[PDB]
Amino acid sequence: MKFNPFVTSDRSKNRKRHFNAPSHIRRKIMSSPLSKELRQKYNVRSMPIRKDDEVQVVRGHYKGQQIGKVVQVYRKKYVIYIERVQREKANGTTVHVGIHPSKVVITRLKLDKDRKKILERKAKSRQVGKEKGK
Amino acid sequence: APSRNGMVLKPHFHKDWQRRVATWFNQPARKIRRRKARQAKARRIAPRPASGPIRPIVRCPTVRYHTKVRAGRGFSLEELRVAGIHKKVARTIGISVDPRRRNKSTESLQANVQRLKEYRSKLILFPRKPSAPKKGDSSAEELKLATQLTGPVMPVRN
Amino acid sequence: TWRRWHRRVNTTQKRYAICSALAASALPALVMSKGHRIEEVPELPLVVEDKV
Amino acid sequence: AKIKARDLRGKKKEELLKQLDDLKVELSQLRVAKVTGGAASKLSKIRVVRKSIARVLTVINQTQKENLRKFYKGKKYKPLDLRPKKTRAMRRRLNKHEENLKTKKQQRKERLYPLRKYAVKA
Amino acid sequence: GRKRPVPKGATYGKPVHHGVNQLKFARSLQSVAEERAGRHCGALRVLNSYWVGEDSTYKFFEVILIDPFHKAIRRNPDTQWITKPVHKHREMRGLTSAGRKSRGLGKGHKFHHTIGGSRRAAWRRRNTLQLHRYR
Amino acid sequence: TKGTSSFGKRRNKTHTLCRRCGSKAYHLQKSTCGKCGYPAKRKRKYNWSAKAKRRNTTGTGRMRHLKIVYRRFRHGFREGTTPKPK
Amino acid sequence: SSHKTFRIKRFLAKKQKQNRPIPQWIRMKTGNKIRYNSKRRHWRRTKLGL
RNA sequence: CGACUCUUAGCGGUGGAUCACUCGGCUCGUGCGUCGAUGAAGAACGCAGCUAGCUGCGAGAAUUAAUGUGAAUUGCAGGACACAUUGAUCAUCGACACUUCGAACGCACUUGCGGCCCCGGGUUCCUCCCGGGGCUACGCCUGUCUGAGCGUCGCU
RNA sequence: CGCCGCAGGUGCAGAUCUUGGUGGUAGUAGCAAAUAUUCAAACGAGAACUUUGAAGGCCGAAGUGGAGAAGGGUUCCAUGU
RNA sequence: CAUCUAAGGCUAAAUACCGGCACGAGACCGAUAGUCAACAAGUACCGUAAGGGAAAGUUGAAAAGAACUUUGAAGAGAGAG
RNA sequence: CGCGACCUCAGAUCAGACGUGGCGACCCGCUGAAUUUAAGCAUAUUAGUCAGCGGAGGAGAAGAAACUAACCAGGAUUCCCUCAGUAACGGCGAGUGAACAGGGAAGAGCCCAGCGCCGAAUCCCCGCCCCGCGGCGGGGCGCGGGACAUGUGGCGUACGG
Ligand SMILES: [Mg+2]
Ligand SMILES: [Mg+2]
Ligand SMILES: [Mg+2]
Ligand SMILES: [Mg+2]
Ligand SMILES: [Mg+2]
Ligand SMILES: [Mg+2]
Ligand SMILES: [Mg+2]
Ligand SMILES: [Mg+2]
Ligand SMILES: [Mg+2]
Ligand SMILES: [Mg+2]
Ligand SMILES: [Mg+2]
Ligand SMILES: [Mg+2]
Ligand SMILES: [Mg+2]
Ligand SMILES: [Mg+2]
Ligand SMILES: [Mg+2]
Ligand SMILES: [Mg+2]
Ligand SMILES: [Mg+2]
Ligand SMILES: [Mg+2]
Ligand SMILES: [Mg+2]
Ligand SMILES: [Mg+2]
Ligand SMILES: [Mg+2]
Ligand SMILES: [Mg+2]
Ligand SMILES: [Mg+2]
Ligand SMILES: [Mg+2]
Ligand SMILES: [Mg+2]
Ligand SMILES: [Mg+2]
Ligand SMILES: [Mg+2]
Ligand SMILES: [Mg+2]
Ligand SMILES: [Mg+2]
Ligand SMILES: [Mg+2]
Ligand SMILES: [Mg+2]
Ligand SMILES: [Mg+2]
Ligand SMILES: [Zn+2]
């Protein structure tokens, strides 16, 4: 279990940190697993969700194999919006349904200089971890 | 109001004692902090005895305790003179000195200077500059024989 | 806060309770009555080699 | 078309004040449009121009201050705003030199009777 | 001596506390002189004082003050101690010689009221109920 | 008449705002605040009112300077230094 | 009264400015919890401090 | 026959108990243990595109810079943002800035009025007006300058 | 939640008990100090009460008039609900 | 006879800590409880002032917060969703 | 009948510094009740406590014996256990009430004045030059000022020198 005396296991404290988390660590909290193909291509398991990458919902009313492109990362509400994941409200317009990023898998990653660097860092740390434990 | 037999009790609780109550819930924390400070201090004085300087052999004052012998504050100046140790060099080599204690008998005086001779024979004196040894000690005698002593230095026994 | 939360037990009694608890841990009826599923255990004072 | 402080720092006092004058004129026109209706594009440009003014002024003040520090470097008396602002108590302390100087008597004690390193056998 | 400052000498209470005259201050007049010198010169530190003369209505003392921030004091050890923040306003805490005499400090059988560092230090230790964890 | 009739006669203010502590306790005719005692150098403060002490104690306001002091203490009050530039 | 000091008039200005209803778009904010301006003041009902 | 009243139950009201929940307390413990004339604590007034309070901030005013991070903020709008002729947001915070009262400091205040030294303008340097900048509190130490005394002296 | 132990801020009808809610009273007492209103029209879903006009009255210049000081602090003034 | 050497001065450690900064924990309380304050709380409000001082948590997984039709001037309804 | 030396005083928006006010849980110096108990009540008790005033620091205060003891003697201060609800105080009523020795936590010692010796050996400020800015120091120079013989510094303090 947990042995660090400077890390809390208090339920009330942990919930306060989660709901009052600043934006830059809300980005870490709102991570998504990668697909099995990407988990093999890169040596990483999970990755913080991004604006323009393509996911598919794995839990809820919108389960399926349809690949939808993320269009909004609403960090304040801890949800993300995806392309065709939407419902028609009363007046006839369509609105997106908030989906927690932990319930999707990133099939394609919106790659830039920062993303490639993070993927290399996560993979390199994993390689060192399995090297130590080998 | 008294009720049948009993003691005449005089509790000293007439003076608002509740505003001065010492709890001891920090006693286990205080013992840990003391033990940590002891270990850190012993690490600070690396080969020197952890407990501290050598204390003299001292008889307890009153008629209740004069059959018993314990450790005193420091060796008197008369003890250091006949043992042949400077009263300012004694502190640097780990001997505690009490300048306000005087010897009244030669039995206690001689017992303490024999104690000083035992300590002086057991002392391993590192040279001040480890590269250049002047008069401290042989390299063999301090190569590994210099270990940090634990407990009181030559504990006083009855 | 000064409710006397702590109790002191005699050392001889604390050692007594250890001996009773160890002696009871060698009787299969007492361990089974704790519900410990010692049914295929080869021997109730179960001793393993020092490699563990 | 924004203003970045990084590219401001090479500029001189003359053009920095010219840029400040241009920004202030633009802000005054934006405040006019704010009270005369205008558009949301001009209303939202108010914050952009306001931060640009602060950016220019910060560059001007930082340049002047660091020039003053370079000017007063090595002089006995500096202006009070150029002196360290540690803490009132920390500024009343004895400095490092006089916290560490000793009497000739204490120097003689340490010369004659220095603390030794020793170990005692059991 | 100290006349009790009550209107018309009325000390509303039990007869034992009816005293107005013949009352005495717990600190000497030399300490009061040191306190008045220190308060006026708040930027200086009282060192000591001594008696220089008296008549029926006045006592005259001379108080030695030190400028803690003068360089002749700062650069000299054996007198740097007065410049430490813990030593400001000694005369208002009874740390000078005159002030200390009124606290009952001393060694041995005559001064058991101040074992602990002060009268209040002794009183707290003797009047605190040590409730251990195991009783 | 001590009741309703006499209440009509009150139109002259005893107290006004205080330029220190901002309370309406500044007695005009005595030129002294009844809450802080403004013309005195020291703030009026009494241990028989702990509730009043915690109404105006340190931390009940803004602490424009103290909140920066606590933040600067975590690095030892360094000055004249900058992070290593990129 | 008509005669007043600058400090009094500035004090009355702030009370006037903050005695206004809350915006309607505040109700649409996330985790709002605010229904209406609870610190509203009417001149006849509640008198100012001064 | 009805009304009315009483009892019981179904349904519906009024009310907000109970239960479940808990970004709050209370208690204990640990490590630090840091304010201020270089202007504190505290107070007032201000600052957002739409903003009243809370929160943040000070005319650079819900923030500037730097560094770390690395695509958001979001209630609506607008608008950047090649994310490598460099960057949204957030965090850190060492640079810069920090209105007026306040120990509060030119004098004074439920108002208001000076003085001195420089600078710019109307003057077209001389001192009137306007504006800007810096000073102008008390106590006290060291030194400096200017002094006082039928205080003690020397030369005269 | 049951059983074996442990520990309590552990059981309410009362205290002119504390806090909150709810009845009968009860559609009851009442909406009775300073003479007084009426007609027509307009707007309006709706008029004893608003607006206009016509009457009849009152304040009767020590006023129910016109202005101020103190105090209030936007109550001032338009538009709308 | 014993014992010290007053009327000058400095000095760390062990010790204290219901204020402060940052943490951890609990056989504690669970919205009339626990801080007065779980919430725009030392706030609203009261008093000339010193000072006194509250009440107030819960839609739902997601606002998907009821489009549209119909009676009414609207509040409010009936359908529908 | 002016000019100087000193003494004692004064002024300055003089050059450079320092104090003020806040917090105040803990700490130091004062001041200081009454409710209460005594089944009344005045001494006593509450209590050297609440309230009041002043002053600090991360701790404060204390502190290296004008000590304890009476022993085969111990040896600065502070804290814990115990001594001890004891010796003692007290309308000897109600009540109050330490210390030494012992065991531990920690442990650390010292500096002046005076008496003396040393050609004031001493210190501050101001300039000029160099080495560095981090808590402003070093080194060199000035027939540069001042302080100081009404006593600065070195040796040296009861453990003797
Ligand atoms: Mg000397
Ligand atoms: Mg009495
Ligand atoms: Mg009356
Ligand atoms: Mg009056
Ligand atoms: Mg009214
Ligand atoms: Mg019901
Ligand atoms: Mg920035
Ligand atoms: Mg006036
Ligand atoms: Mg003369
Ligand atoms: Mg109960
Ligand atoms: Mg009941
Ligand atoms: Mg009726
Ligand atoms: Mg009627
Ligand atoms: Mg008439
Ligand atoms: Mg009129
Ligand atoms: Mg009107
Ligand atoms: Mg409930
Ligand atoms: Mg509550
Ligand atoms: Mg209605
Ligand atoms: Mg000056
Ligand atoms: Mg003070
Ligand atoms: Mg009685
Ligand atoms: Mg009685
Ligand atoms: Mg009585
Ligand atoms: Mg008190
Ligand atoms: Mg001290
Ligand atoms: Mg001392
Ligand atoms: Mg001595
Ligand atoms: Mg006993
Ligand atoms: Mg007593
Ligand atoms: Mg020990
Ligand atoms: Mg000398
Ligand atoms: Zn005030």
| Measured distance CA(A1)–CA(G6) in Å, rounded | 67
Contacting partners of chain D (3+ CB pairs under 8 A): B, E, F
| Measured distance CA(E76)–CA(E66) in Å, rounded | 13
D99 CB and strand K closer than 7 A = yes
What's the F81 CA to ligand 15 centre distance in angstroms? 74
| Measured distance CA(E13)–CA(B84) in Å, rounded | 71
- The 3-state secondary structure of D35-50, one letter per residue: HCCCCHHHHHHHHHHH
| CB-based contact E49:E34 (threshold 8 Å) | yes
Nearest chain E Cα distance for residue D65, angstroms: 30
Q: E strands within chain F? A: 15-16, 26-27, 32-33
Pair of tokens at residue F71? 């933040």
E97 CB and strand J closer than 7 A = yes
| CB-based contact B122:B76 (threshold 8 Å) | no
Share in percent of chain A as helix, strand, coil (round to 5): 35, 25, 40
C3 and E CB contact within 8 Å: no
Alpha carbons within 13 angstroms on the beta-carbon side of residue B58 total 16
Eight-state DSSP code of residue B134: S
| CB-based contact B79:B56 (threshold 8 Å) | yes
Chain F residues inside the 8 Å CB shell of G1: none
- The 3-state secondary structure of F45-69, one letter per residue: CCCCCHHHHHHCCCCCCCCCCHHHH
Q: Which residues contact G22 (CB under 8 A, 6 or more apart)?
A: G34, G36, G37
Spatial distance from the CA of D80 to the C1' of H73 (Å)? 41
| Measured distance CA(A116)–CA(B128) in Å, rounded | 58
Pair of tokens at residue D78? 């500096």
| Measured distance CA(A19)–CA(A26) in Å, rounded | 9
- The pair phi, psi for residue E99, each rounded to 5°, is -65, -35
The span from the first CA to the last CA of chain F, in angstroms, equals 82
Chain E residues inside the 8 Å CB shell of C7: 134
D85 and F CB contact within 8 Å: yes
| Measured distance CA(A125)–CA(A119) in Å, rounded | 10
CA-based nearest residue in chain C for residue B18: C2
- Determine the residue among D85, D91, D92, D93 to mutate to test chain F binding: the one whose Cβ has the most chain F Cβ atoms within 10 Å: D85
Pair of tokens at residue B14? 């007439």
CA–chain centroid gap for D18, Å, is 24
| CB-based contact A96:A86 (threshold 8 Å) | yes
Contact D86 F77 (CB under 8 A): yes
Strands A79-82 and B21-23 turn out to be unpaired
D115 and B CB contact within 8 Å: yes
Q: Which residues contact D107 (CB under 8 A, 6 or more apart)?
A: none
Place of tokens 């393993």: C48
Computed from CA positions of residues B66, B67, B71, B74, in that sequence, does the dihedral angle turn out positive or negative? positive
- What Rg value do the Cα atoms of chain G yield, rounded? 15
Spatial distance from the CA of A98 to the C1' of J61 (Å)? 10
Of the candidates D6, D2, D121, which has an alpha carbon nearest to the alpha carbon of residue D52? Answer: D2
| Measured distance CA(B54)–CA(B71) in Å, rounded | 9
Physical contact, F and B (3 or more Cβ pairs within 8 A): no
Please count the other Cβ atoms lying within 10 Å of the Cβ belonging to residue E105.
15
Torsion from C-alpha of C32, C36, C38, C40, nearest 10 degrees: 140
D91 and E CB contact within 8 Å: no
Place of tokens 């209706």: D37
Eight-state DSSP code of residue E57: S
* D119 DSSP β-pair partners: B124
Nearest chain E Cα distance for residue B99, angstroms: 18
Computed from CA positions of residues F28, F31, F34, F36, in that sequence, does the dihedral angle turn out positive or negative? positive
List the shell of residues around ion ligand 33, using CB closer than 5 Å.
F 18, 21, 33, 36, 38
> Angle at the Cα of D9 (from D3 to D13), degrees rounded to 5?
100
Of the candidates B144, B97, B106, B104, which has an alpha carbon nearest to the alpha carbon of residue B124? Answer: B144
Residue G28 CA: distances (Å) to CA of A96, B16, G21, G32: 17, 58, 15, 7
Q: E strands within chain D? A: 118-120
Name the amino acid, one letter, at D31.
R
Please count the other Cβ atoms lying within 10 Å of the Cβ belonging to residue F37.
18
Strands E129-131 and B21-23 turn out to be parallel
Residues in C lying within 8 Å of B, measured between beta carbons: 1-2
| CB-based contact F32:F39 (threshold 8 Å) | yes
- The 3-state secondary structure of B102-133, one letter per residue: CCCCHHHHHHHHHHHHHHHHHEEECCCECCEC
Largest CA-CA distance found in chain E, in angstroms, rounded: 64
* E49 DSSP β-pair partners: E63
Contact B47 D117 (CB under 8 A): yes
Resolution (A): 2.8
Q: At what angle do helices D40-71 and D13-35 cross, to 10 degrees?
A: 150
- The 3-state secondary structure of E88-124, one letter per residue: CCHHHCCCCHHHHHHHCCCCCCCCHHHCCCCHHHHHH
* F16 DSSP β-pair partners: F26
Q: Which residues contact E66 (CB under 8 A, 6 or more apart)?
A: E44, E45, E47, E73, E79, E82
**DSSP SS3 for E52:** strand
Q: Which residues of E65-82 are buried (b: 16+ CB within 10 A; e: fewer)?
A: bbebeeeeebeeeeebeb
**DSSP SS3 for A80:** strand
| CB-based contact D107:B131 (threshold 8 Å) | no
Hey, which residues 115-134 in chain E have their CB within 8 Å of chain C? 131, 133-134
Strands B123-125 and F26-27 turn out to be unpaired
| CB-based contact A58:A75 (threshold 8 Å) | no
CA-based nearest residue in chain B for residue C2: B23
Q: Which secondary structure element, helix H or strand E, spans residue D90, and what is its range?
A: helix D88-91
Q: Which residues of D1-35 are buried (b: 16+ CB within 10 A; e: fewer)?
A: eebeeeebeebeeeebeebbeebeebbeebeeeee
| Measured distance CA(A68)–CA(A62) in Å, rounded | 11
Chain C residues inside the 8 Å CB shell of B25: 1
Residue A91 CA: distances (Å) to CA of A34, A85, A88, C51: 37, 18, 8, 74
CA-based nearest residue in chain G for residue F24: G50
Nearest chain F Cα distance for residue D101, angstroms: 24
**Which nucleotide in the DNA or RNA is closest to residue G16, CA to C1'?**
I74
* B132 DSSP β-pair partners: B129
What's the E4 CA to ligand 24 centre distance in angstroms? 28
Please count the other Cβ atoms lying within 10 Å of the Cβ belonging to residue C34.
10
Physical contact, D and B (3 or more Cβ pairs within 8 A): yes
Q: Which residues contact G12 (CB under 8 A, 6 or more apart)?
A: G48
Torsion from C-alpha of F41, F47, F53, F57, nearest 10 degrees: 60
| Measured distance CA(B78)–CA(B110) in Å, rounded | 10
Question: How many residues make up chain A in this entry?
Answer: 134
Contact F24 G49 (CB under 8 A): yes
CA–chain centroid gap for E68, Å, is 21
| Measured distance CA(E81)–CA(G16) in Å, rounded | 60
Computed from CA positions of residues C32, C35, C40, C45, in that sequence, does the dihedral angle turn out positive or negative? negative
E13 CB and strand K closer than 7 A = yes
DSSP code per residue over E33-50? HHHHHHHHTTTSEEEEEE
| Measured distance CA(B94)–CA(D115) in Å, rounded | 9
- The pair phi, psi for residue B37, each rounded to 5°, is -70, -35
F7-46 residues near strand J (Cβ < 7 Å): 13-15, 23-25, 34-35, 46
Pair of tokens at residue B67? 């059959």
Pair of tokens at residue G24? 């309607």
> Angle at the Cα of E88 (from E85 to E90), degrees rounded to 5?
135
CA-based nearest residue in chain F for residue G48: F24
Task: Please state how this structure was obtained.
Answer: cryo-EM
F82 and D CB contact within 8 Å: no
Alpha carbons within 13 angstroms on the beta-carbon side of residue D79 total 8
DSSP code per residue over A47-62? EE--TT-EEEE-SSTT
| CB-based contact D27:D78 (threshold 8 Å) | no
Nearest chain F Cα distance for residue G13, angstroms: 16
Chain E residues inside the 8 Å CB shell of D101: 75, 77
**DSSP SS3 for A85:** coil
Spatial distance from the CA of B37 to the C1' of K85 (Å)? 37
| Measured distance CA(E35)–CA(E43) in Å, rounded | 13
* Closest by Cβ to E77, choosing from D89, D92, D101: D101
Please count the other Cβ atoms lying within 10 Å of the Cβ belonging to residue A99.
21
Residue E119 CA: distances (Å) to CA of B15, E26, F80: 18, 13, 49
Contact E85 D89 (CB under 8 A): yes
| CB-based contact A106:A49 (threshold 8 Å) | yes
Residue C4 CA: distances (Å) to CA of B14, B20, B28, B152: 22, 17, 16, 36
**DSSP SS3 for A3:** coil
| CB-based contact A80:A104 (threshold 8 Å) | yes
